[PDB]
């Protein structure tokens, strides 16, 4: 559809500008390997994921028209899912990062479900457009805590879901299951809200300096 193609190109122009700075990528190879240096790298990565996702969010069609408090509630409420999704994308476009994660002092209670999500979404071989649309769909969720005008958010989310589904008919014709499989990775993704809340209470994790952006977006 003519209005849908315009929507999609707008999403892609914004999504394609997102990149993790090469300098962080180099750190994966170049830094000393210790629990503390490893944790720091993951912190800088997480911080940059939020940075990028804010820039992406403020370019989503309609987002600037929303009530200001609702904007904030979206950013904070969708942060955990969006960041986790983005970290899966980064990881799957690496062996070394995995080893750093496995040796950063983070408990296997949290590491295990993380790698299961990464593997699951990796096996789906999602295209750049699927990542972009899903990301936008996660950010524009009308069910976040404290949203005053949920119907306004729903009107921004629904055309993205339509484009995404419709795309799935276009590129994977006669297989309704590709789209349903995308939505099942979203089911895994949402389980991370609870994993995250528990990690923040944990000893190792909370006895660190998180960056200011992480502190703020996670309501620490």
């Amino acid at each position: 559809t003519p209005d849908q193609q315009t929507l999609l190109h707008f999403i892609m122009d914004s999504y394609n500008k997102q990149r993790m700075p090469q300098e962080i990528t180099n750190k994966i190879l170049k830094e000393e390997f210790s629990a503390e240096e490893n944790f720091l790298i993951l912190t800088e990565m997480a911080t940059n994921h939020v940075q990028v996702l804010v820039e992406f969010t403020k370019k989503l069609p309609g987002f600037q028209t929303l009530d200001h408090e609702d904007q904030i509630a979206l950013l904070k409420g969708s942060a955990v899912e969006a960041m986790f999704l983005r970290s899966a994308e980064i990881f799957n476009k690496s062996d070394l990062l995995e080893e750093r994660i496995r040796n950063s002092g983070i408990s296997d209670e949290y590491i295990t479900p993380m790698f299961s999500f990464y593997k699951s979404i990796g096996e789906l071989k999602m295209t750049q457009e699927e990542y972009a649309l899903l990301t936008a769909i996660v950010i524009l969720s009308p069910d976040r805590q404290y949203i005053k005008d949920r119907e306004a958010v729903e009107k921004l989310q629904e055309p993205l879901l339509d484009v995404l589904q419709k795309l799935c008919k276009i590129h994977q014709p006669e297989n309704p299951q590709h789209f349903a499989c995308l939505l099942g990775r979203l089911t895994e993704l949402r389980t991370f809200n609870h994993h995250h809340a528990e990690m923040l209470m944990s000893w190792r994790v909370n006895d660190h300096k998180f960056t200011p952006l992480l502190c703020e977006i996670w309501d620490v």
Binding site: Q51, V54, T57, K58, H68, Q71, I72, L75, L213, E216
Partner: peptide, 7 residues
Amino acid sequence: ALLRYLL
């Protein structure tokens, strides 16, 4: 405040 600034 941080979030509003970046937005």
